[PDB]
Amino acid sequence: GAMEIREQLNLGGIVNAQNAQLSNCSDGAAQLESCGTAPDLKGITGWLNTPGNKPIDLKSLRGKVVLIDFWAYSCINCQRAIPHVVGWYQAYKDSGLAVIGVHTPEYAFEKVPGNVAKGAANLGISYPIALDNNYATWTNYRNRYWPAEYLIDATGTVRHIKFGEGDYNVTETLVRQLLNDAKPGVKLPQPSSTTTPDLTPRAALTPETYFGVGKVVNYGGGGAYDEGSAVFDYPPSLAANSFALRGRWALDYQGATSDGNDAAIKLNYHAKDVYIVVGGTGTLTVVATLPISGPPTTHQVVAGYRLASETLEVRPSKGLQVFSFTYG
Amino acid sequence: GAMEIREQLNLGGIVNAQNAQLSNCSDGAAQLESCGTAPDLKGITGWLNTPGNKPIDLKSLRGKVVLIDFWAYSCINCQRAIPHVVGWYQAYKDSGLAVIGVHTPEYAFEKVPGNVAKGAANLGISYPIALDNNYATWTNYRNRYWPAEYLIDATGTVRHIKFGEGDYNVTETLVRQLLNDAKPGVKLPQPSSTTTPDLTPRAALTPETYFGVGKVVNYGGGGAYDEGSAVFDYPPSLAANSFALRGRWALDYQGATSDGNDAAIKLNYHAKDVYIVVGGTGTLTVVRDGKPATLPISGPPTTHQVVAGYRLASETLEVRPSKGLQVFSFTYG
């Protein structure tokens, strides 16, 4: 529990000499703010989309407007936001905009450079990517949400910080203002939002449904949910926005691996679209069948007509590991 | 870290049969929403402002619109928000509005019935107060912040949930709508917002500055900050929105107690007003821009304003608490 003023940035981690002024900015303000020199990009385990995959020091970007975008490739929220970021990079890179996609992993499989690179290609990311496998940059920036953006002006000062998915036009308007501050009289094309649709869902979807023993918050099944294998069964009645298991499953801090060939998952949700984050090679049947292979990622299992309360069952073939259910 | 859609309620605790649909509401929506029957008010250790101090069961309030208001008496955000709630209670009680202030304590001293009562008296609260000393209700409601509000319609269904300070008119508008839904044609006085000013600060103040060993996030003195008594000194340079200690101090998980006649705190903050939550009996000496002030400290621990600025800005100040005074935090306005 904490006190909060609406629109206040809910920063994580602690205060150090580099990030002490970040709290001087609010969460996604419509007007430019000023909250200190951008903290260093540190502990980056590797880079992508840069010459010889060499690192980029923010100080080398002075003179340009810089947008720091925190993401994770399997994150559905990030998947919906990134197209807007790609559009901005495309529209403004030749006008003074630099973009750095800081990839801070939510899961272990997101620490694999190859999986990340594959995810980026699918999203059309061409801008530099910094792998934040030790959460050093995420922590230095006092972030706590996916997606998250920090907008830096040409002098290296943070002028806008936005946590969460949505409100693209607010941010693009400030990016345009800063490009002009950096290069007075600069001529820019019409806003990228003109041709990039805002597909942000109403913010009342089922909470991210984790299967990791240590993160689980909505397992509506009777009875314990600890590590190791065991045989589960659906309860007489499952709570709304909750899930239950049927069959043999193996549970660990990462997720739930389908064991027996009878394993099944029942889910009561509230959304329009449903996605499952699964790893491994196998087949996934939903009550339709879907082949599962390659780097773990989101697989859409529900493409609804509208946002409403519904139920669905998923049968992961043995071997398939479920990390969570995300929504849209 | 977690995923988030802006305006999404960042609920806490786990999902149970009573609160499973709360996530169906967004954070402070301007239109009515529907997110399940209101969870039970669980494990309340005491009640104030009810006949015989007896408990209130939400089911007994069916037919009335019910506003659940989570607060803590020493919370400055809550202190600024409550006058709005008091205004609503006074304006709508006779039109069908029931209000319950669930007092979930942030500090141990806030669990004391008498301290809460005095805090409530100072704030003009005359509506029922439920002491949530074991956080049972806070948890059943999956709340995460002070202040927080849950608006329940006459059928006992939650239709609005708002976390944090601000946006009073959005909520009052829904309260009026629900009062009409409960009693179609009901006549209401003009909105309380008409006579109650919105004094919500810009949302860019120094974060709540805790002195508790397990909560501290902006101690810039450098070195160890563990529980026990020790001698401190100010660092060569103190970072913005941070504090440092000088002199002897005794630290624990509740706060920092002055343990000498030389104890002092230096604070770099970004706000207009500054308050210190402190307990014990003694005197507090504060110096801002070369101007000192002496403050007598006694009675229930609570907020004491140490700075009344003219505008929001980055500033520094020093506080020297007589030995024995316990500093819990610095909060802002």
Side-chain angles (χ1 to χ4, degrees), chain A residues 1-30 32-53 55-58 60-117 119-182 184-201 203-214 216-225 227-247 249-252 254-260 262-304 306-317 319-328, chain B residues 1-201 203-260 262-290 292-309 312-333:
Chain A
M3 301 191 304
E4 181 203 55
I5 295 181
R6 289 172 70 70
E7 306 193 315
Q8 194 186 324
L9 278 175
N10 295 309
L11 300 172
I14 56 177
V15 177
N16 62 47
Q18 275 184 34
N19 60 33
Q21 306 173 85
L22 294 175
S23 63
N24 287 6
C25 278
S26 56
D27 190 353
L32 292 174
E33 300 183 307
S34 191
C35 49
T37 295
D40 292 349
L41 297 175
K42 52 184 59 186
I44 297 301
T45 57
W47 292 74
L48 292 179
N49 294 329
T50 65
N53 289 336
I56 299 178
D57 186 303
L58 292 185
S60 74
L61 296 180
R62 291 293 172 74
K64 285 192 176 188
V65 172
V66 184
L67 177 68
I68 306 301
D69 188 82
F70 285 87
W71 66 299
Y73 87 82
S74 71
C75 173
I76 194 65
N77 288 32
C78 295
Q79 281 178 41
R80 289 188 298 252
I82 286 166
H84 294 269
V85 182
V86 168
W88 295 336
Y89 185 58
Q90 172 85 300
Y92 310 123
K93 54 197 188 63
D94 301 317
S95 298
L97 175 68
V99 177
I100 296 176
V102 178
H103 190 270
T104 306
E106 192 188 317
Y107 299 99
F109 69 75
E110 280 176 340
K111 292 197 182 183
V112 182
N115 296 329
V116 181
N122 189 61
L123 296 172
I125 297 177
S126 302
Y127 49 80
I129 294 176
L131 307 173
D132 196 29
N133 291 325
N134 294 320
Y135 321 113
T137 292
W138 171 289
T139 300
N140 200 38
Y141 271 65
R142 303 200 70 201
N143 182 38
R144 80 156 65 220
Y145 300 106
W146 282 285
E149 301 192 317
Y150 295 69
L151 182 56
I152 312 165
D153 70 20
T155 69
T157 304
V158 180
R159 312 293 296 288
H160 179 71
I161 303 185
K162 183 179 69 184
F163 287 179
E165 183 190 351
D167 294 309
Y168 301 103
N169 299 359
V170 172
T171 302
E172 176 165 29
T173 292
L174 299 180
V175 166
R176 292 166 71 82
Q177 280 179 27
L178 290 182
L179 289 171
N180 208 281
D181 290 342
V186 63
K187 292 168 67 177
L188 311 168
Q190 63 179 352
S192 180
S193 64
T194 302
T195 55
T196 299
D198 185 348
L199 307 175
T200 309
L205 308 183
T206 296
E208 173 169 15
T209 304
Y210 314 84
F211 282 77
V213 180
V216 71
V217 68
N218 62 331
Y219 165 61
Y225 197 95
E227 178 154 4
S229 185
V231 177
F232 302 75
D233 199 294
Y234 298 163
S237 55
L238 181 66
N241 301 305
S242 307
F243 79 85
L245 306 172
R246 176 170 65 63
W249 295 80
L251 313 179
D252 56 56
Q254 270 297 316
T257 311
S258 177
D259 197 301
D262 62 312
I265 299 177
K266 186 170 190 170
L267 174 69
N268 287 315
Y269 64 83
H270 181 250
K272 186 233 289 182
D273 300 308
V274 182
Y275 307 80
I276 188 174
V277 175
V278 58
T281 298
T283 309
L284 188 167
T285 307
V286 320
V287 190
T289 185
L290 310 174
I292 302 303
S293 55
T297 186
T298 56
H299 290 278
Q300 177 160 25
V301 296
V302 179
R306 64 145 183 167
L307 161 58
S309 302
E310 263 293 327
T311 305
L312 72 72
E313 191 173 22
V314 164
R315 296 204 194 66
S317 67
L320 296 180
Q321 177 177 42
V322 182
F323 298 88
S324 70
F325 272 116
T326 48
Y327 312 89
Chain B
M3 295 196 302
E4 181 202 58
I5 294 177
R6 292 171 67 67
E7 293 177 1
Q8 186 179 72
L9 280 173
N10 294 310
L11 304 166
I14 61 175
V15 175
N16 65 43
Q18 298 203 338
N19 59 39
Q21 296 189 294
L22 291 179
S23 60
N24 283 10
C25 279
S26 58
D27 190 354
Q31 287 73 57
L32 292 171
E33 300 178 312
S34 183
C35 51
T37 295
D40 288 353
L41 296 183
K42 295 178 177 299
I44 296 302
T45 56
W47 287 80
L48 302 185
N49 294 341
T50 62
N53 296 72
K54 291 173 182 172
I56 291 177
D57 178 346
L58 292 178
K59 296 177 184 302
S60 68
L61 300 183
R62 295 296 199 271
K64 287 187 176 188
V65 174
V66 185
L67 176 66
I68 301 298
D69 190 74
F70 282 88
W71 66 299
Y73 84 77
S74 72
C75 174
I76 192 68
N77 295 25
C78 297
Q79 285 182 34
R80 292 190 295 258
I82 288 172
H84 294 273
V85 178
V86 164
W88 295 336
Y89 187 61
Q90 308 184 322
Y92 307 125
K93 64 171 71 170
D94 297 319
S95 294
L97 178 70
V99 174
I100 298 177
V102 179
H103 185 272
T104 305
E106 190 188 323
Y107 302 101
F109 70 75
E110 281 174 333
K111 294 186 178 179
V112 182
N115 298 342
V116 181
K118 294 172 183 174
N122 285 333
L123 293 170
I125 299 181
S126 62
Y127 49 80
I129 294 172
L131 310 174
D132 194 21
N133 289 348
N134 295 317
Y135 323 101
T137 293
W138 172 288
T139 301
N140 200 40
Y141 271 68
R142 305 196 71 201
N143 183 37
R144 174 190 293 288
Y145 310 92
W146 284 283
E149 288 185 346
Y150 296 68
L151 183 56
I152 306 162
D153 69 20
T155 80
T157 305
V158 182
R159 310 294 294 283
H160 179 69
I161 304 183
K162 187 178 70 188
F163 286 176
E165 182 187 350
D167 296 310
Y168 300 106
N169 296 359
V170 178
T171 304
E172 178 161 25
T173 290
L174 301 184
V175 170
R176 293 166 71 81
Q177 274 175 38
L178 291 181
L179 289 171
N180 184 66
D181 285 351
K183 292 199 303 177
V186 61
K187 292 192 173 179
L188 307 170
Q190 284 295 65
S192 184
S193 55
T194 296
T195 55
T196 302
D198 183 351
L199 308 175
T200 309
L205 310 181
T206 297
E208 184 175 356
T209 302
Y210 315 91
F211 286 77
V213 176
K215 272 175 165 296
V216 64
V217 301
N218 64 338
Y219 169 60
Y225 193 99
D226 297 303
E227 80 161 305
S229 188
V231 181
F232 299 73
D233 212 312
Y234 292 164
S237 61
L238 182 58
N241 301 307
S242 300
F243 76 90
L245 300 179
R246 158 173 285 178
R248 193 168 182 70
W249 290 86
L251 318 177
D252 56 54
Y253 291 69
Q254 279 294 304
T257 305
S258 178
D259 196 48
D262 56 351
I265 303 170
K266 179 154 64 178
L267 174 73
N268 282 332
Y269 67 90
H270 180 254
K272 164 148 68 63
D273 300 312
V274 181
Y275 306 88
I276 184 170
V277 173
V278 56
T281 303
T283 294
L284 205 63
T285 301
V286 64
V287 181
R288 181 203 175 195
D289 297 315
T294 299
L295 307 168
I297 304 300
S298 69
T302 187
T303 44
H304 288 273
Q305 182 162 19
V306 294
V307 178
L312 167 53
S314 293
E315 281 266 47
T316 300
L317 111 194
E318 183 179 67
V319 175
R320 301 202 302 276
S322 57
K323 182 172 177 175
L325 289 186
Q326 179 169 48
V327 176
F328 299 91
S329 74
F330 273 121
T331 53
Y332 313 86

